[PDB]
Symmetry: none
Subunit: 22 residues, 8 copies
C-alpha cells in the first residue's frame, strides 16, 4: 500500500485471515 499492509476478513466466520498487500 509504500509499505506492506494486511487485509483481513470477517465474513460470517467464513474467514478471519489476512493477506499482505503493498
Amino acid at each position: 500500500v509504500a509499505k506492506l499492509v494486511f487485509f483481513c476478513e470477517d465474513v460470517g466466520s467464513n474467514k478471519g485471515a489476512c493477506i499482505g498487500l503493498m
Copy 2:
C-alpha cells in the same frame, strides 16, 4: 490496531472494500 490494518467486506463480484483500522 499500534499499526494500520485493513478490514474488508463483500461488495459483490467477489470484490472487497477495505477500511483501515489502527
Copy 3:
C-alpha cells in the same frame, strides 16, 4: 465531501484500500 465518504483504489487480489475523506 459535509459528510465522510470512502475513496478506494484497487490494491490487487480483489481488494480495495479505502480511506475516509470529506
Copy 4:
C-alpha cells in the same frame, strides 16, 4: 459500517461510481 456510508472508486482511468455500505 452502524451507519450507511458511501464507497467510491478513484482507481485510475475508470471514473468513480459508488455504493452504500453499512
Copy 5:
C-alpha cells in the same frame, strides 16, 4: 473537491491540523 485537497485549522504552537476533502 475530483481531487484531494487538505483544509487546515491552526492549533497553535506553530502547527495546524488538516483534513482531506474531495
Copy 6:
C-alpha cells in the same frame, strides 16, 4: 480505532496531514 480517529503526520510548513482511521 469503533470510532473514527484522525492520525496526523507532519508534512512541513507546520502542517499535519490527517487521515481518518477506525
Copy 7:
C-alpha cells in the same frame, strides 16, 4: 470537525498524544 473527533500523532521521540477538535 459538527462533532468532536480526536486527532493523534506521535510526539517527542515516541509517544502518541491526541487532542479533541471539532
Copy 8:
C-alpha cells in the same frame, strides 16, 4: 503527501489561500 497536494486555510489570515506540500 506520492504527489503534490494543496493545503488550504479555512479561517484567519490566509483563508482561501493554499500551499503545495508533498
